[PDB]
Design a protein around this ligand. Structure first.
Ligand SMILES: *[C@@H](O)[C@H](C[C@@H]1CCNC1=O)NC(=O)[C@H](CC(C)C)NC(=O)OC[C@@H]1C[C@H]2C=CC[C@H](C2)C1
Ligand SMILES: *[C@@H](O)[C@H](C[C@@H]1CCNC1=O)NC(=O)[C@H](CC(C)C)NC(=O)OC[C@@H]1C[C@H]2C=CC[C@H](C2)C1
Ligand SMILES: [Cl-]
Lengths: 300, 297
């Protein structure tokens, strides 16, 4: 299995740069609106303790430099929605794809198009951790880079990048500007909660192992969902939700292994360890492949 | 993090190519479509295909090329080694600036995996020392290409042709010459003994340091030759002075002499990771080049 990103072209066609003063970051140009992090209006000194509403009242449309490459897009309106700026421009992006704004759940994966000065640098797959951080590769000027999934023809944007935490991980918002997790866009010390293992993805990985004929860990027991959740939490694994049980439905049907039987198999791996064996060539259980990612790669 | 080049410039070049009951992908640059020649085979032909003889018996109209909902008319066809070149009457407006390159083992590239001429995913691969690649390719992925982007220029280096019994993959450059001792015939083929790309393991240990992780370092040092003796023992490629040079900037940046990192890698090989992990992995990663790590740092 590989970490496999979505093709990025449909998103590349939407990246622009947004500058205020000498503060430059990236924006997302969809139809006649550009979306970007609101701290573009901050001087580096204002980031320490910004009053965004006051900062914004001092701004006019003509204080915003929006460029696709080096071609300026005239700003004709601006508003602030949570932690994102919406800049109305006078040109509809002819490369706008079919798109959606979605708020993802911890455990879900997405591709990130890392951009600098409105130019794509690279694409990679990230998982949203249960503590609402992502382990990204973001440098200065990467803010406004977005994360997304592609379903059929439709780009679902789920992430816009805003900041790095002391520990090196990254935090950001959905495309309505609501942070994932207990973070704020202020240049202050913030800590993410202790992280946990993404149980639904580990289960997906076990199903993947079975599909490929590696199935020594299947046992003859089952569990209730509640009993499993209480045990898993003792090993710093996330509890399963009803939605998690549902999204494993296709892999369960493909293999004929009921979700709760697989949970019972995982519980035994947690309680007794691997006893020296490997699964898919690894002694570690992988938690950054969703049930969709497994399907994607095993038949796409 | 394992980071691929943005794939947009390549997506605008992928088409579907069909001959008979066989469909795979082609690469449309200017007025030419490049694709694997085994698209002209049938099940029978699979096993010992005499390609020049199968090709002379095809007409331009035996090739159905589709770019989206639009059929492109084939006005001419020739074969260069294991790739078919289909001339079409329409030029691709989305053709990027591009070059064809043949890469060295240990170099990396991005793959755009396609099916029916439509992009499915993008990921980073390295040309293994035994000239396989550890890809994610299914039925219908042939004609998918690998590439690097420098400036606005796409350097195509790989076109996909086959899977081996071990699950790894083989293919050609865009001149149609295989990497490695493989042949486009439907048979089970083994590769040479794979070895680990040592300069890339070292680049990736420097990456772990640059990200605050240094549990594997040590006070020891080694000579180049003494390190290479140990490397070879564990089926690692030897490290050349040019590799050492190439590693300079990462050495300077971290203040860790190349040969000190070699001494760290030696310790890891002889003792193992003893449970610990590096940049998230229980195994030494060898598919980041020094340039890869640098660009991302
Ligand atoms: C995009 O503008 C930029 C991207 C950062 C820079 C390097 N890596 C990233 O992900 N975002 C910022 O600079 C943030 C702006 C504020 C208004 C949210 N600030 C930020 O991420 O600070 C990084 C800190 C600096 C310092 C203080 C506390 C924790 C660490 C040390 C990291
Ligand atoms: C593209 O047409 C296709 C891509 C393959 C299929 C599955 N994964 C891939 O990467 N290429 C082919 O099918 C090859 C065509 C020949 C003419 C070169 N053949 C091929 O890849 O065969 C796979 C071998 C043989 C077969 C039988 C035993 C072991 C495996 C299945 C490996
Ligand atoms: Cl003809």
């Amino acid at each position: 299995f590989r970490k496999m990103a979505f093709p990025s072209g449909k998103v590349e066609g939407c990246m622009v740069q947004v500058t205020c003063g000498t503060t430059t970051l990236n924006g997302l140009w969809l139809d006649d609106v550009v979306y970007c992090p609101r701290h573009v209006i901050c001087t580096s000194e204002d980031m320490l303790n910004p009053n965004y509403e006051d900062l914004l009242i001092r701004k006019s449309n003509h204080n915003f430099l929006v460029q696709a490459g080096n071609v300026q897009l005239r700003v004709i309106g601006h508003s602030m929605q949570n932690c994102v700026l919406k800049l109305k421009v006078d040109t509809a992006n002819p490369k706008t794809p079919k798109y959606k704004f979605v708020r993802i759940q911890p455990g879900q994966t997405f591709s990130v198009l890392a951009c600098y000065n409105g130019s794509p640098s690279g694409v990679y797959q990230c998982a949203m951790r249960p503590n609402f951080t992502i382990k990204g590769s973001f440098l200065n000027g990467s803010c406004g880079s977005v994360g997304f999934n592609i379903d059929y023809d439709c780009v679902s944007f789920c992430y816009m990048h805003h900041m790095e935490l002391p520990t090196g991980v990254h935090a950001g918002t959905d495309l309505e500007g609501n942070f994932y997790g207990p973070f704020v866009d202020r240049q202050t010390a913030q800590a993410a909660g202790t992280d946990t293992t993404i149980t639904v993805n580990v289960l997906a990985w076990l199903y993947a192992a079975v599909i490929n004929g590696d199935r020594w860990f299947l046992n003859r027991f089952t569990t209730t969902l509640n009993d499993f959740n209480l045990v898993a939490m003792k090993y710093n694994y996330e509890p399963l939700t009803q939605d998690h049980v549902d999204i494993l439905g296709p892999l369960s049907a493909q293999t004929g292994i009921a979700v709760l039987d697989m949970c019972a198999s995982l519980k035994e791996l947690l309680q007794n360890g691997m006893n020296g064996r490997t699964i898919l060539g690894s002694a570690l259980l992988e938690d950054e492949f969703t049930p969709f990612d497994v399907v994607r790669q095993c038949s796409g």
